[PDB]
């Protein structure tokens, strides 16, 4: 019966390809060929942070745009006060292999995950004055790539088992599981409304998932190699993807096909992290050329290069109020950049 | 000045945290790290117990050095996408089963186990990250091969092989065949050693290899290289 099933699947693929052909009318450049260019963008390091002794892999801003959390391979989770460069907490870890970290919106819990295939939850505000483990979620078969909190009692995770999962923390049991990826997924960015969330995998495919019904809704393709990073537009109707080749892409949601690509001749290496500014005009990316780049989203032209790291830029983040940009590389350093007037 | 009392207290807290981090790094610096790889057929679960989840960690102390052995073979994912986390290790221990040339893989029966080990070694030796990391080769199941080579020649997997069917000639031929796969024979040193029942001697071999690599690293640090 495989023959007929394959033939009808191919027919449906042709049907959707024709539908996408009907959808596409004009490219983004034909519309954004008249707006004013953003001009030169120059930023410098207002403050620098030190204390790690190994490569930094993850970094997440708090909800108040003041407190920071960083994770590195020496087995430490450090919470920084970026205003005056003090350390408020230094949590030791049980496993030294981590690749993600998060900050709960309220500001009471933090989360960690790595090669150990378990998600650890830490509680900050207690009566006795030390951080403690609150939950150790387990059940995934494969390394965890990213974790993001939902409501201080729910969490969503993505792993190398080609699977995403949704958990509640009290009982510590899975509620819904998302499957449909051939290669392993390595990035997810939750929507502001916490109703839908998108994920990009290593098979050059991105997908949309509903958080309650737990089924795939839209499937996006257009890349060749693996997809390494993803981020959500502040509006909630678009998202950007970073690729293992020297390309980035922007997708809209009500139209399944892509809008614009970001590439250049001199750049050959891939993209590690991607983040958006709050106004949605600037697109920040980290590369393997030991520097970060800024793209004008509506025009796909370079407008700024942040140099100053001696190794690969691993993590990149933007505050909620959009006042500073945080960057972390493999040289055991963290940096906070902000332009001057 | 222009700072409050609570600012002073926070500054002292930060200084204490920095001191603790420095001491932790000082303690963690003097430790050797070994990464264990190889085909999952055999030879990996035996050397791990000769010394005495997705990742497994083992600690053992020998002649006043601390050894951390990392075994990751149950991860079952894309090796490229996480093999870079192990850059900076002292050495890679590769275990190769020897009495499997006659043996045939369950999948792709026309394709032999020995060729799978060969391609694994060719992929791991010439990787971009491990350009200076030494590789310690462990050829396993000597007795099984001795009782097996007496019946079948290497032509079942090595048709071009020539020479006598005795044990020593075949063992030397296989060792040379595996050592020939190295391309950058200026920085790497491949140490080969056939295993036996006694576990004390294997630890001595890994100790000597680690000592040589660490002395080379110290010479590189001082610029005398």
């Amino acid at each position: 019966e495989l023959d007929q099933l394959r033939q009808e699947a191919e027919q449906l693929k042709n049907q959707i390809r024709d539908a996408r052909k009907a959808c596409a009318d004009a490219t983004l450049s034909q519309i954004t060929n008249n707006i004013d260019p953003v001009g030169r963008i120059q930023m410098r390091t207002r403050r620098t942070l030190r204390g790690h002794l190994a490569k930094i892999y993850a970094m997440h801003w708090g909800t108040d745009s003041r407190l920071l959390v960083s994770a590195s391979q020496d087995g430490k989770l450090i919470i920084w006060d970026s205003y005056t460069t003090n350390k408020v907490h230094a949590i030791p870890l049980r496993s030294s292999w981590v690749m993600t970290c998060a900050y709960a919106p309220s500001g009471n819990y933090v989360a960690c995950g790595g090669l150990d295939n378990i998600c650890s939850i830490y509680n900050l505000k207690t009566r006795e004055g030390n951080v403690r483990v609150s939950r150790e979620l387990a059940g995934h078969t494969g390394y965890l790539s990213c974790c993001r909190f939902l409501d201080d009692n729910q969490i969503v995770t993505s792993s190398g088992d080609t699977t995403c999962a949704l958990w509640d923390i009290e009982t510590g049991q899975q509620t819904t599981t998302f499957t449909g990826h051939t290669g392993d997924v390595m990035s997810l960015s939750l929507a502001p409304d916490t109703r839908l969330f998108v994920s990009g995998a290593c098979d050059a495919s991105a997908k949309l998932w509903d958080v309650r019904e737990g089924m795939c809704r839209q499937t996006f393709t257009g890349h060749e190699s693996d997809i390494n990073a993803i981020c959500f537009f502040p509006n909630g109707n678009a998202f950007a993807t970073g690729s293992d080749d020297a390309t980035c892409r922007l997708f809209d949601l009500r139209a399944d096909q892509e809008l614009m690509t970001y590439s250049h001749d001199n750049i050959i290496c891939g993209i590690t992290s991607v983040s958006f500014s709050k106004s949605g005009r600037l697109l920040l990316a980290g590369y393997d050329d030991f520097n970060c780049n800024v793209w004008d989203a509506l025009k796909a032209d370079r407008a700024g290069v942040l140099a100053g790291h001696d190794n690969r830029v691993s993590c990149l983040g933007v505050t909620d109020d959009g006042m500073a940009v945080a960057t972390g590389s493999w040289d055991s350093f963290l940096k906070i950049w902000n332009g001057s007037s | 000045c222009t700072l409050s009392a609570e600012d002073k207290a926070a500054v002292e807290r930060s200084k204490m945290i920095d001191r603790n981090l420095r001491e932790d790094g000082e303690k963690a610096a003097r430790e050797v790290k070994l990464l264990l790889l190889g085909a999952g057929e055999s030879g990996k679960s035996t050397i791990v117990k000769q010394m005495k989840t997705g990742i497994v960690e083992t600690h053992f102390t020998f002649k006043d050095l601390h050894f951390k052995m990392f075994d990751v073979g149950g991860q079952r994912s894309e090796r490229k996408k996480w093999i870079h986390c192990f850059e900076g290790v002292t050495a890679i221990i590769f275990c190769v089963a020897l009495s499997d040339y006659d043996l045939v893989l369950a999948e792709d029966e026309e394709m032999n186990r020995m060729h799978e080990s060969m391609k694994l070694f060719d992929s791991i030796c010439n990787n971009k990250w491990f350009t200076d990391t030494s590789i310690i080769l462990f050829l396993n199941k000597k007795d099984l091969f001795e009782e097996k080579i007496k019946k079948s020649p290497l032509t079942i997997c090595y048709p071009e092989y020539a020479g006598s069917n005795t044990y020593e000639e075949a063992a030397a031929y296989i060792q040379c065949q595996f050592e020939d796969l190295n391309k950058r024979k200026d920085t790497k040193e491949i140490y080969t050693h056939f295993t036996c029942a006694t576990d004390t001697k294997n630890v001595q071999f890994v100790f000597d290899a680690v000592t040589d690599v660490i002395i080379k690293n110290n010479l590189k640090d001082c610029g005398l290289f």
Partner: single-chain antibody, 232 residues
């Protein structure tokens, strides 16, 4: 969390006394320690201060020289040594914890205290309300007054509120003039700007009986107000 102390009683003049604070139920090395004396029929006055790691040691002018304060972190104990006593040192003492970092709440816990009876510039806080009779269900406001401005360029105002019931230890209600602690109900509120400082209670329960205190924590001489007495 508990804090029990020992030592004291009747002492002849010219002697010496060892006072001990023994802590159990929480981490200790991350906390700084304070001592506070209580006048026989008046408000409290600050005495000493030791910080975490035994780096900074602070005293009061009236007790300098003959007072010493030390700690033993591994055994979780705190010591005060007093010499050359006199009729002034007739008070019942309290042992207080405080932790300092971004977002922390200093002066969260208080102890029971022990009695010491003996035989025969600084910013000033004034509360001139003395005593006021109120009935349950009637909203109440309490005023505290300073001399110098209590606002620093870091955007923080250092005023603390305390409430003392008859037969109990003080409890913290408001820190940094505007924030509630843990265990306090919602009906307590606080506000004010510059010098005049206001505390408001909307609903009154039977348990809301006693003396209210305002405290400053800007300059290290820590002075208490006269206090507000509330009764039915």
């Amino acid at each position: 969390v508990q804090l029990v102390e020992s030592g004291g009683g009747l002492v002849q003049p010219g002697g010496s006394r060892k006072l001990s604070c023994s802590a159990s139920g929480f981490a200790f090395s991350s906390f700084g320690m304070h001592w506070v004396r209580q006048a026989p029929e008046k408000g409290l006055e600050w005495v000493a201060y030791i910080s975490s790691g035994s780096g900074t040691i602070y005293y009061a002018d009236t007790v300098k020289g003959r007072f010493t304060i030390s700690r033993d972190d591994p055994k979780n104990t705190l010591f005060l040594q007093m010499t050359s006593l006199r009729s002034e040192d007739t008070a019942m003492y309290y042992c207080v914890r405080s932790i300092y970092y971004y977002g922390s709440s200093p002066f969260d816990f208080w102890g029971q205290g022990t009695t010491l009876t003996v035989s025969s510039s600084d910013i000033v806080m004034t509360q001139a309300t003395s005593s006021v009779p109120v009935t349950p269900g009637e909203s109440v406001s309490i005023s505290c007054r300073s001399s110098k401005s209590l606002l620093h360029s870091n955007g923080n105002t250092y005023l603390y509120w305390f409430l003392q019931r008859p037969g109990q230890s003080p409890q913290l209600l408001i820190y940094r003039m505007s924030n509630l602690a843990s265990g306090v109900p919602d009906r307590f509120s606080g506000s004010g700007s510059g010098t005049a400082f206001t505390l408001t209670i909307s609903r009154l329960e039977a348990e809301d009986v006693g003396v209210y205190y305002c405290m400053q924590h800007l300059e290290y001489p820590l002075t208490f107000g006269a206090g507000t007495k509330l009764e039915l």
